[PDB]
């Protein structure tokens, strides 16, 4: 599924991401935009044996288990295929854990590159929340 901007914002808000650990909703929408272009089935297979999965491109070395990645920690305790659903719940819950395990949103390169220092509010402006 390829989400619309406002549709994804609403879904993320229903899942409690607005101001989660001090990160406004627009940060999360902006991250998904440039990680995956809102595509829940996006995959990126890296040369190091790991794969990035889903709308938030969560990596299979630390966070989910796909059975083929060396050094898998599976800290979200889910199969990576669960992150390829049209329901974003599993990706949201694992993203929360990624932050809860010490990291900020610096854990997403696309956020560091394309969202940090910008008016992230623009990504939810105009939406019915």
Curated annotation (Swiss-Prot):
Self-association state and partner proteins as the record states: Monomer.
EC number assigned by the record: 3.2.1.17
Tissue: In the egg white and polymorphonuclear leukocytes.
Family note: Belongs to the glycosyl hydrolase 22 family.
Catalytic activity: Hydrolysis of (1->4)-beta-linkages between N-acetylmuramic acid and N-acetyl-D-glucosamine residues in a peptidoglycan and between N-acetyl-D-glucosamine residues in chitodextrins
Residues annotated to bind substrate: 101
Disulfide bonds: 6-127, 30-115, 64-80, 76-94
GO terms under cellular component: cytoplasm; endoplasmic reticulum; extracellular space
CDD domains associated with the record: LYZ_C
Name of the coding gene: LYZ
Species whose genome carries this gene: Gallus gallus (Chicken)
Alphabetized UniProt keyword annotations: Allergen, Antimicrobial, Bacteriolytic enzyme, Disulfide bond, Glycosidase, Hydrolase, Secreted, Signal
Leftover remarks: Lysozyme C is capable of both hydrolysis and transglycosylation; it also shows a slight esterase activity. It acts rapidly on both peptide-substituted and unsubstituted peptidoglycan, and slowly on chitin oligosaccharides.
Name of the molecule in the record: Lysozyme C
Active site: 35, 52
Catalytic class of the enzyme: hydrolase
Record-level GO BP terms: cell wall macromolecule catabolic process; defense response to bacterium; defense response to Gram-negative bacterium; defense response to Gram-positive bacterium; killing of cells of another organism
Main localisation: secreted
Record's subcellular location: Secreted
Source organism superkingdom: Eukaryota
């Amino acid at each position: 599924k390829v989400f619309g901007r406002c549709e994804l914002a609403a879904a993320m808000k229903r899942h409690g991401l607005d101001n989660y650990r001090g990160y406004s909703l627009g940060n999360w929408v902006c991250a998904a935009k440039f990680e995956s272009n809102f595509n829940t089935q996006a995959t990126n297979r890296n040369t190091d044996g790991s794969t990035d999965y889903g709308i938030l491109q969560i990596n299979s070395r630390w966070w989910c288990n796909d059975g083929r990645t060396p050094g898998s920690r599976n800290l979200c305790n889910i199969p990576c295929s669960a992150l390829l659903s049209s329901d974003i719940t599993a990706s949201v819950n694992c993203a929360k854990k990624i932050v809860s395990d010490g990291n900020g949103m610096n854990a997403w390169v696309a956020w560091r590159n394309r969202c940090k220092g910008t008016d992230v509010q623009a990504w939810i402006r105009g939406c019915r929340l």
